[PDB]
Amino acid sequence: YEEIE
Amino acid sequence: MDSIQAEEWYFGKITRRESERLLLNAENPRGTFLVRESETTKGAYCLSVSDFDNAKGLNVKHYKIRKLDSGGFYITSRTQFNSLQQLVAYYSKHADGLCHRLTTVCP
């Protein structure tokens, strides 16, 4: 999954 | 009446193959997303989205939606929501460093 950054 | 069981962005429990097969469509516009049940997670949801680049093609980014045991949700350690809908509204008008502001939902 991706991460909000 | 608004029940999470029949949300405009709630398909339910689907497989991963069909998931990428729904966002990876030449007819789907860049920004299409869809919230389903956690297939690999537990007691949580998963908000996926579609993106397009002018170099390779359209890819699919999966943003697992977390859930606070207290009663909340959040895909990042900075913003929290009291309903998967609230999280879809904020990320629907503010990418906040996401892949693309939500624009359409999965049919």
Beta bridge partners of B60: B50
CATH number at residue B53: 3.30.505.10
* Containing structural domain, residue B36: 1-107
Residues on chain B touching A3 (C-beta within 8 angstroms): 76
CB contact (8 A) between residue B62 and residue A1: yes
Residue B17 φ then ψ, to 5°: -60, -50
List CB contacts of B81: < 8 A, sequence separation 6 or more. B72, B73, B74, B87, B90
Residues on chain B touching A1 (C-beta within 8 angstroms): 46, 62-64
List CB contacts of B85: < 8 A, sequence separation 6 or more. B4, B7
Count of Cβ atoms closer than 10 Å to residue B69 Cβ: 6
Eight-state DSSP code of residue B56: S
Nearest alpha-carbon partner for B63 in B34, B103, B26, B85: B34
**Measured between alpha carbons, how far is B49 from B59 in angstroms, rounded to an integer?**
9
Q: Which method was it determined by? A: NMR
Domain count of the fold of chain B: 1
Q: What angle do CA B21, B22, B27 make, to 5 degrees?
A: 105
